[PDB]
Design a binder for these strands. Structure first.
Ligand SMILES: [Cs+]
Ligand SMILES: [K+]
Ligand SMILES: [K+]
Length: 14
RNA sequence: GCUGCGGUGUGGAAGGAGUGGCUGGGUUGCGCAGC
Protein backbone atom coordinates (compact mmCIF):
# COMPACT_ATOMS: atom_id res chain seq x y z
CA UNK A 1 0.00 0.00 0.00
CA UNK A 2 2.57 2.57 -1.10
CA UNK A 3 0.14 5.29 -2.19
CA UNK A 4 -2.02 7.96 -0.56
CA UNK A 5 -1.30 7.48 3.16
CA UNK A 6 -4.26 9.61 4.25
CA UNK A 7 -7.46 11.01 2.80
CA UNK A 8 -10.15 13.68 2.92
CA UNK A 9 -9.98 16.97 1.05
CA UNK A 10 -6.39 17.75 0.13
CA UNK A 11 -4.81 15.79 2.98
CA UNK A 12 -1.87 13.56 2.19
CA UNK A 13 -0.80 14.95 -1.13
CA UNK A 14 2.82 15.23 -2.18
C1' G B 1 -3.22 2.02 -5.40
C1' C B 2 -7.77 4.62 -3.61
C1' U B 3 -10.82 7.03 0.00
C1' G B 4 -13.23 9.20 4.73
C1' C B 5 -12.67 12.55 9.67
C1' G B 6 -10.84 20.76 11.83
C1' G B 7 -9.73 14.69 14.25
C1' U B 8 -3.58 17.10 15.39
C1' G B 9 -0.42 21.76 15.81
C1' U B 10 6.34 25.66 18.66
C1' G B 11 -1.52 29.74 17.22
C1' G B 12 -5.33 25.02 16.76
C1' A B 13 -8.92 28.64 22.06
C1' A B 14 -12.89 32.59 18.65
C1' G B 15 -11.44 29.28 11.52
C1' G B 16 -11.64 25.52 6.83
C1' A B 17 -10.80 19.96 3.93
C1' G B 18 -7.37 24.10 1.26
C1' U B 19 -12.23 29.64 -2.62
C1' G B 20 -5.46 31.62 2.17
C1' G B 21 -1.84 27.08 1.09
C1' C B 22 4.26 29.62 -4.00
C1' U B 23 2.35 33.70 3.30
C1' G B 24 4.38 29.76 7.45
C1' G B 25 4.55 25.01 10.25
C1' G B 26 3.48 21.69 4.90
C1' U B 27 5.38 19.97 -2.52
C1' U B 28 -1.39 19.30 2.57
C1' G B 29 3.16 17.84 7.55
C1' C B 30 0.84 14.68 11.99
C1' G B 31 -2.94 11.17 14.07
C1' C B 32 -7.14 7.88 13.50
C1' A B 33 -10.17 4.92 10.21
C1' G B 34 -12.17 2.34 5.68
C1' C B 35 -11.69 -0.36 0.63
CS1 LIG C 1 -4.16 20.45 8.24
K1 LIG D 1 -3.58 27.34 9.17
K1 LIG E 1 -3.63 24.11 8.63
Amino acid sequence: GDGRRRGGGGRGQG
